[PDB]
Design a protein around this ligand. Structure first.
Ligand SMILES: *CCC(=O)Nc1cc(-c2c[nH]c3ncnc(Nc4ccc(CN5C(=O)c6ccccc6C5=O)cc4)c23)ccc1OCCO
Length: 267
């Protein structure tokens, strides 16, 4: 349905505070105040940087897809405002991005939380695959925390250190290159937000991968968890797991979390 996407008037939303900013734009915490309603809805508003040159119809075409996603672990576009800039409106995710959440809360994050996040991210990615949507930038920074045990993928619709080798070398992006990025994302979570290949120039990463080197086993990970991660980083894209398999395997591990992760204080 085109009814799934609200075209917002400028009076219908208000930017109140800054949530974050970067080269691509600024995200604000604000309020959606729909006309003819009696409510004020907390939202996040991303204002993209103004472009010197796509056409409004093509933008709306893409926005409709983002408004059509229907899965508890993928963000949905609630509204759009087209002016000199593109502004994207979606529900506020009050706990912020998962990367910063895990860094801030590391001393209080247990194994069942970690494995549940892995399940949820795999479910959202499997949904994108069912919709034939390749993400291209999955990373812990692009998972948002609605509540501590409800997360959602965002930032879809160059991150060399998350990229599959065939994306770096040949600009090939597929669901299987997203699986590589998923493995790096899991590595970020299991290290409580460490930086992959910290301090290594982006242009050196392909030679690391070519030589057969990979991100190291996080101390908390048992062999079965690290083996899943390593399988996501096979050179042969079709030898990597599928997201539907990752759901099954991490769901199994989340049923016995102390078997699969050994966290600070475990015996
Ligand atoms: C990890 C560092 C970080 O990202 N910080 C950071 C957090 C936020 C942030 C905090 N709470 C938020 N709630 C909701 N949304 C955002 N951010 C956000 C991201 C993307 C978009 C644009 N957008 C959509 O609207 C949409 C809809 C469907 C599918 C995909 C998308 C989509 O990508 C809007 C809002 C929250 C904001 C900014 C932050 O810092 C950024 C620079 O590090």
């Amino acid at each position: 349905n085109q009814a799934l996407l609200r075209i917002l008037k400028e009076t219908e939303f208000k930017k109140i505070k800054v949530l974050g900013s970067g080269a691509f734009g600024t995200v604000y915490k604000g309020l959606w105040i729909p006309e003819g309603e009696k409510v004020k809805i907390p939202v996040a508003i991303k204002e993209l940087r103004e472009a010197t040159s796509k056409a409004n119809k093509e933008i709306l075409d893409e926005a409709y897809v983002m408004a059509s996603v229907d899965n508890p672990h993928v963000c949905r576009l609630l509204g759009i405002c087209l002016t000199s800039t593109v502004q994207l409106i979606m529900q506020l995710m009050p706990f912020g991005c998962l990367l910063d959440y895990v860094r801030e809360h590391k001393d209080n994050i247990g194994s069942q939380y970690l494995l549940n996040w892995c399940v949820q991210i795999a479910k959202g990615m499997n949904y994108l695959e069912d919709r034939r949507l390749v993400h291209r930038d999955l990373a812990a920074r692009n998972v948002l925390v609605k509540t501590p045990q409800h997360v959602k993928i965002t930032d879809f619709g160059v991150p060399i250190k998350w990229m599959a080798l065939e994306s770096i070398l040949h600009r090939i992006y597929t669901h299987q290159s997203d699986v590589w990025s998923y493995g790096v994302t899991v590595w970020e979570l299991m290290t409580f937000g460490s930086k992959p290949y910290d301090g290594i120039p982006a242009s050196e990463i392909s030679s690391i991968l070519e030589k057969g080197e990979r991100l190291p086993q996080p101390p908390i990970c048992t062999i079965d968890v690290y083996m899943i991660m390593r399988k996501c980083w096979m050179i042969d894209a079709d030898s990597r797991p599928k997201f539907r398999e990752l759901i099954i395997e991490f769901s199994k591990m989340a049923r016995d979390p102390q078997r699969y992760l050994v966290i600070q204080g475990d015996e």
